[PDB]
Ligand binder design. Structure first.
Ligand code: MG
Ligand code: MG
Ligand code: MG
Ligand code: MG
Lengths: 106, 227, 141, 206, 320, 67
RNA sequence: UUAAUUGCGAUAACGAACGAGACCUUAACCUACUAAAUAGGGUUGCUGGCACUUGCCGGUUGACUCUUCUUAGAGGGACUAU
């Protein structure tokens, strides 16, 4: 007997976007075909991670500078959900790049 | 561990760089071409695209085995957490890195530079890519520095599609007189480019309209009524 | 429920969110009477739409504007835009098309950004200088 | 005179009948006349405003700079010296004070006074760098009306600042007295003095 | 012979995009809904006070792209708007708030047809489909049968055909150069009317409903019998057309030609008037062309909409 | 400073040559036509193509032109 | 003619390639969509003060509801359009 509502909460992470977006699409499609109550795939400010460096390794030349960056997207979600179907959902449909974390909200 | 998400992502990136430089250092003689890191909740698999798959595999699959332990020894991963997979490259012609390593190896044997480079570019054209370039700089048979370019087809230099299609590799070759820089640029065919745009930005494809005969002017028609 | 609509106005960062209801001529920005905007000289500007149309235009209306961001002049201009946009939105939605028409005519007939947002927005600073289009200095010798 | 009840009580002078837009609720643009027939259409007294500060796009196009209210151009040109480049609030307060002073000195509703001062101090002839290297000369050239307006504003504000520098007298009042001198032909004004000097140099080098 | 000449009375303005469609509520005389490229449906009250014939009432914001066709409800309280923002919108004409947003097309929508009385919704769209919606928002039927964009679907009026039929017939057209009329309950295909040498842009049935007219680029107007299932006549406008509207009482046909408006007396098969109003500063090639037409219930007033963002009223007064 | 370089003009000219009966004086309609009937990567290029096609439609309506 | 070897064209030149553009990031516009206690808002509880007329200004992981504002995806929007 594992009927207790779990309030399970997922949080995604991805350097890129489309993999994260399709992962979220898969998670929501699985939850809805499983008849679950969800708080939608909320959108969080994609944290830009910036580093500005000098191009020249020696400092000679006109001052020229460049800005590398990533843009990380988190977009957590959360379900009012039982265990076994949901934990199985968590352990399925992961592609590389996207990192998934689960907290039970115990 | 309890580590900020941004810090963890940077750590994953620098770990990716770890493995990439590792494989370039060691597996070069076996024809290393690229690395990928895929993670399941269970294990973190490392997928190693190489030219000569068996030599990377080694005798009776021993070689792969040792590499795994090195990783688990170097990066403190527990036994069985990470496994290694060897696959043949889809096609060695397209992967510029394999071509550049082939260049370096063929020079190591002391081959004709122009002959070797033209063999490489001909192989690239044979592989179906729509443009190749190989650049060699250094002490070409002399003391004064030189830099000759050997190109065919055509290559685009500017515009974000440069990253979208054109693969590029650079290698240093150790000859008795010093170091020779080789740069390989391969412009992948947009038609067969997965995971990205299927054509160049300015490639306009007009579609042929199907034709019909217009003589049927009056042509009263009737269907049977349907519920 | 009470006919009520919500609008916004901006100035480069400053955002004024205005909620307008069918009330009794209640005009508060940040929960304070509109007479008390600190610029004190830009003060007439916060009145500025009203005097164009005449406050009698909103005697059965109440406006509350919460405003954040920006500096001060930006804040005041955002408040102005919020007020004008709220008047226009309410009158268009519940009163009549022609009413909104003379309101738009009066607003646009004076300091066009009073109704329309200003798109004039700062751009990033390139390297090599103190400003986006400034260079440090050169020696030559 | 017809006050309207609301939940918030707008003060007397602001709420009474003010569909008669005034500069600072004090001075009216009506009755303001442009003497010289040229500089009309180059001063925007036709447009009534309630503050002398309206941040609009008045410099992107070739000639929209003329649509600026004249008082705002004066304000924006008060702030010189580099250090005080911004702080428009300071400039608008100074100009408001100066309008009050002009209201004191010769009641004549001040906007007419400042417009007349602008008209008078414009140099109708200028000089130009023409002499080539060796036999340098000073050529006499006619001037643009818009340039006359802009030049008048610049010389007025320059005179005001130079009068106020390290001086007990304040910028507002120094500007006011310069405007008073410039409404007439009072050569005590620095602005008209420089205008005369420029006119004379142009004339002597016809 | 038939000395009845209509004259313009005034103009209706307020749209900032082309007057794409008009629609008159049967029950209410002075009500007129007009859609524009400005994405804003304007409801007009007709006033007999002065030169302005009609006066706006409510503007219906809620459309992000072009509004193409407009249809009013039977009572005069709802109106359906077809838009290029990939949706349909149903509006209450008193409050002014849309309550239904019909979603599901892939090519942007072009045409709307109201039910006979109230129950169903008929929409045409570039996605080569015709959608039969309910009043709340769900799509019940997805009619297929056109390879190209369907330009317009209009419900065939049911005058007296049988007392009761339990069936609602309508018509559809597009660039397939074939006109497919349909029946609705259940609600399946029926006959094709292949007549057009160049593609059709507008079809609008006669007020009785047994007759319909189609026209397009070629300038040929094919007028057709619905129940009799026979081609009636083939006029030619000698010019590209935009809209055709049947007059209610007269046996007439207004047509929105590229140059002006051609009125045909169908019984005599002869045109009786051209509409070419005056504009200033238009060098004979930038003449705004009519793209919306509407005949009021009496049939004595015509409402037209050009690209000049103008809606004109043509009062049909007798010239003795 | 807009002059609409070779690619837009050539693609447009082809579109006229192939579909003149299917083009109109309008931009929006011609925009959707060119989007549907040809594959254009970036929508800015598609808008430019539609604009040139509309200009050519207006030119033809005024009078036949070379090329 | 354009900012452009950018085009109109004229043409012992013809067709092609790079560069420019095209392209990507960002900035702006989306009362259209998708949603949101890690962002907000309305109503409504329970409370604090004042005016006492039911009005304001407040507080409050209470309840309900909403997404204009804040987010970020899909997209829409301009191409010199008229
Ligand atoms: Mg290029
Ligand atoms: Mg600076
Ligand atoms: Mg570029
Ligand atoms: Mg929003």
């Amino acid at each position: 007997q594992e009927v207790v509502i779990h309030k399970i909460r997922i949080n995604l992470t991805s350097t890129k976007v489309k993999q994260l977006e399709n992962v979220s699409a898969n998670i929501i499609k699985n939850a809805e075909t499983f008849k679950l109550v969800k708080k939608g795939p909320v959108r969080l400010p994609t944290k830009v991670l910036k580093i500005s460096t000098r191009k020249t390794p020696n400092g000679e030349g006109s001052k020229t500078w460049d800005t590398y960056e990533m843009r990380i997207h988190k977009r957590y979600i959360d379900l009012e959900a039982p265990a076994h179907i949901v934990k199985r959902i968590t352990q399925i449909t992961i592609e590389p790049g996207v990192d998934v974390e689960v907290i039970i909200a115990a | 561990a309890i580590i900020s998400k941004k810090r963890k992502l940077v750590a994953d990136g620098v770990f990716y760089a770890e493995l990439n430089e590792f494989f370039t250092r060691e597996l070069a003689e076996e024809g290393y071409s690229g690395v990928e890191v895929r993670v399941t909740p269970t294990k973190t698999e490392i997928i190693i695209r190489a030219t000569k798959v068996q030599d990377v595999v080694g005798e009776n699959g021993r070689r792969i085995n040792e590499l795994t332990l090195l990783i688990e020894k170097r990066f403190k991963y527990k036994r069985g957490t990470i496994a290694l997979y060897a696959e043949r490259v889809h096609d060695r012609g397209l992967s510029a890195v394999a071509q550049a390593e082939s260049m370096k190896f063929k020079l190591l044997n002391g081959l004709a530079i122009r002959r070797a480079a033209y063999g490489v570019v001909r192989y690239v054209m044979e592989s179906g890519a729509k443009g190749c370039e190989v650049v060699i700089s250094g002490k070409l048979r002399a003391a004064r520095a030189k830099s000759m370019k050997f190109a065919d087809g055509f290559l685009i230099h500017s515009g974000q599609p440069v990253n979208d299609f054109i693969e590029t590799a650079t290698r240093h070759v150790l000859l008795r007189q010093g170091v020779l820089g080789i740069k390989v640029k391969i412009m992948k065919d947009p038609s067969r480019n997965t995971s990205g745009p299927k054509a160049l930005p300015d490639a306009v494809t007009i579609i042929e309209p199907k034709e019909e005969e217009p003589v049927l002017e009056p042509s009263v028609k009737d269907y049977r009524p349907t519920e | 429920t009470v006919p009520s609509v919500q609008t916004f106005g901006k100035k480069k960062s400053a955002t004024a969110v205005a909620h307008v209801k069918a009330g009794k001529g209640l005009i508060k920005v940040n929960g304070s009477p509109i007479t008390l905007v600190q610029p004190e000289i830009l003060r007439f500007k916060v009145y500025e739409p009203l005097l164009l149309v005449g406050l009698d235009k909103f005697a059965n209306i109440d406006i509350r504007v919460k405003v954040t961001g920006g500096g001060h002049v930006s804040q005041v201009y955002a408040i102005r835009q919020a007020i004008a946009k709220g008047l226009v939105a309410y009158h268009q939605k519940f009163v009549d098309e022609q009413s909104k028409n003379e309101l738009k005519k009066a607003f646009t007939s004076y300091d066009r950004t009073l109704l329309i947002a200003d798109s004039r927005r700062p751009e990033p600073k390139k390297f090599g200088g103190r400003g986006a289009r400034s260079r440090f200095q050169k020696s030559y010798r | 005179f017809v006050p309207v009840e609301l939940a918030t009580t707008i003060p007397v002078e602001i709420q009474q009948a003010q569909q008669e837009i005034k500069l600072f609720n004090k001075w009216s643009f009506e009755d303001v006349e442009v003497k010289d027939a040229s500089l009309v259409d180059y001063i925007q007294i036709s447009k009534p405003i309630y503050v002398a500060h309206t941040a609009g796009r008045y410099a992107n196009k070739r000639f929209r700079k003329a649509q600026c209210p004249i008082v705002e151009r004066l304000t924006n040109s008060l702030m010189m010296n580099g250090r005080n480049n911004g702080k428009k609030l300071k400039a608008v307060r100074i100009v408001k004070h100066t309008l009050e002073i002009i209201n004191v000195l010769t009641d004549q509703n001040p906007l007419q006074v400042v417009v007349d001062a602008i008209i008078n101090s414009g140099p109708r002839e200028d000089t130009t760098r023409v002499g080539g290297g060796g036999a340098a000369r000073r050529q006499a050239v006619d001037v643009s009306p818009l340039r006359r307006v802009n030049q008048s504003i610049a010389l007025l504000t320059i005179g005001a600042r130079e009068a106020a520098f390290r001086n007990i007298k304040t910028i507002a009042e120094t500007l006011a007295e310069e405007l008073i001198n410039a409404a007439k032909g009072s050569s005590t004004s620095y602005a008209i003095k420089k205008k005369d000097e420029l006119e004379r140099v142009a004339k002597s080098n016809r | 012979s038939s000395n009845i000449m209509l004259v313009l009375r005034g103009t209706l303005e307020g749209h900032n995009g082309w007057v794409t469609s008009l629609s008159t509520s049967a029950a209410q005389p002075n009500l007129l809904v007009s859609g524009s490229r400005d994405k804003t449906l304007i409801s007009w009250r007709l006033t007999e006070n002065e030169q302005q014939f009609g006066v706006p009432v409510r503007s219906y914001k809620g459309h992000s792209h072009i509004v193409q066709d407009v249809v009013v409800s039977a009572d005069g309280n709802y109106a359906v708007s077809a838009s290029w923002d990939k949706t349909l919108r149903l509006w209450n004409l008193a409050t002014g708030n849309s309550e239904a947003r019909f979603v599901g097309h892939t090519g942007d929508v072009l045409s709307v047809a109201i039910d006979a009385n109230s129950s169903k919704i008929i929409s045409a769209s570039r996605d080569k489909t015709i959608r039969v919606w309910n009043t709340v928002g769900d799509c019940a039927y997805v009619l297929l049968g056109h390879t190209d964009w369907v330009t317009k679907v209009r419900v065939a009026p049911k005058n007296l055909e049988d007392v009761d039929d339990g069936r609602i017939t309508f018509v559809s057209a597009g660039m397939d150069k074939i006109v497919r009329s349909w029946s609705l309950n259940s609600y399946r295909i029926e006959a094709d009317f292949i007549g057009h040498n160049n593609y059709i842009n507008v079809v609008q049935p006669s007020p009785d409903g047994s007759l319909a007219a189609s026209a397009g680029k070629d300038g040929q107007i094919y007028v057709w019998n619905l129940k009799h299932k026979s081609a009636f006549m083939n006029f030619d406008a000698k010019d590209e057309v935009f809209a055709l509207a049947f007059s209610p009482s007269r046996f007439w046909l207004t047509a929105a030609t590229a140059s002006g408006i051609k009125i045909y007396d169908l019984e005599n098969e002869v045109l009786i008037d051209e509409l070419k109003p005056e504009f200033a500063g238009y060098t004979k090639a930038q003449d705004p062309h009519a793209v919306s037409l509407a005949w009021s219930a009496d049939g004595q007033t015509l409402f037209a909409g050009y690209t000049d963002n103008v809606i004109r009223v043509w009062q049909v007064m007798t010239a003795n | 400073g807009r002059v609409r370089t070779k690619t837009v003009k050539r693609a447009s000219k082809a579109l006229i040559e192939k579909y003149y009966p299917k083009l109109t004086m309008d931009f929006q309609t011609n925009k959707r036509l060119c989007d549907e009937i040809a594959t254009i990567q970036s929508k800015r290029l598609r808008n430019k193509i539609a604009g040139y096609t509309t200009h050519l439609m207006k030119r033809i309506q005024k009078g036949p032109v070379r090329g």
